[PDB]
Amino acid sequence: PKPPIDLVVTETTATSVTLTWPVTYYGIQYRAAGTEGPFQEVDGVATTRYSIGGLSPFSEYAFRVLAVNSIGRGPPSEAVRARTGEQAPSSPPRRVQARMLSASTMLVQWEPPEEPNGLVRGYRVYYTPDSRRPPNAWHKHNTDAGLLTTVGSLLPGITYSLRVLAFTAVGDGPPSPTIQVKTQQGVPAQPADFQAEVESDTRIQLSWLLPPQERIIMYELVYWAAEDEDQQHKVTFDPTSSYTLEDLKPDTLYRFQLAARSDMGVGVFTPTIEARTAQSTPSAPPQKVMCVSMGSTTVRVSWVPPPADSRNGVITQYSVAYEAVDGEVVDGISREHSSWDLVGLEKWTEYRVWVRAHTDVGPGPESSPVLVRTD
């Protein structure tokens, strides 16, 4: 007989293909192109429709039909192409690997799974700093169909665990075995025994243990004032086990982090430590000093405390000194006073008056004198 010609693919699933097209019956012969030469055979198809089952998902096959009658068989028809449908992956990604790119960025790489069962639409990377955490408590990072990715915002100084799974449009596949991410080769370790010692109101000496047999090139110290989180400082210096910071502001809380740089870059910073500088004497006088004579022998002096940034400590007391140039000292004034009444002055007499602020360390500078005459 002549081969059938109207061979048409009518339905396609993940594991089955339905085909439709004077003979007695038909035979359906099929092989996958990239496989072995010998075809598989389905014999005795008495109708013009049939559904071939048992196929593998996401696999390309070739189909052809020949006709047979009472005389014998005939040549096969032209071959037609077909690709089975998708399923969820059945194998995890292969050769998963990871390493630290920076102090907080890791690079992850892998190979496609051996059994994707479809077109991969992306991957899901699960990672945790504590392997004791349950698997579903890990952080999930989704990627596209690429075979590598980066994850930032990691916590520094810790070794992560990781495993990746693939998913098609159907669902997720199994996750790979857990792997451990590698470390930067020549990058130094987080400094150990990092301490801060208050030396004075302007000096703080930092100390730590120098790492043994480690190609340290220089240390990087980053510090800032707690009240000025936006403004930070950084000083680099030759390798040592101690460093004294100088010229700091008195009565100021400072925060510190330390890192180590080798020829291969800087390591992870220490956690933040804190220290407050000691107090000093005030560096500015009270502001807005005014003097008024309410009577013939009384003068009222008014002032406001120095600006907060120049007190260098808690103001503990005030002192008033006076001296008359033409005519013939009260300390221990409590910190809550904003005015004090000078009594017993001479009529129509000019005095020189200075106002002064104090900390526990001592007195600061006094304001420029304000002149006032009684009566």
Curated annotation (Swiss-Prot):
Region named Disordered: 74-93, 364-375
Subcellular compartments: Membrane
Residues annotated as domain Fibronectin type-III: 3-87, 92-186, 190-280, 285-375
Protein family membership: Belongs to the protein-tyrosine phosphatase family. Receptor class 2A subfamily.
Functional note: Possible cell adhesion receptor. It possesses an intrinsic protein tyrosine phosphatase activity (PTPase) and dephosphorylates EPHA2 regulating its activity.
Disease: Aplasia or hypoplasia of the breasts and/or nipples 2: A group of congenital deformities encompassing total absence of breasts and nipple (amastia), absence of the nipple (athelia), and absence of the mammary gland (amazia).
Subunit architecture: Interacts with GRIP1. Interacts with PPFIA1, PPFIA2 and PPFIA3. Interacts with INSR.
Name listed for the protein in its UniProt record: Receptor-type tyrosine-protein phosphatase F
Organism expressing this protein natively: Homo sapiens (Human)
Gene name in the database record: PTPRF
Residue window of the full protein shown: 319 to 704 of 1907
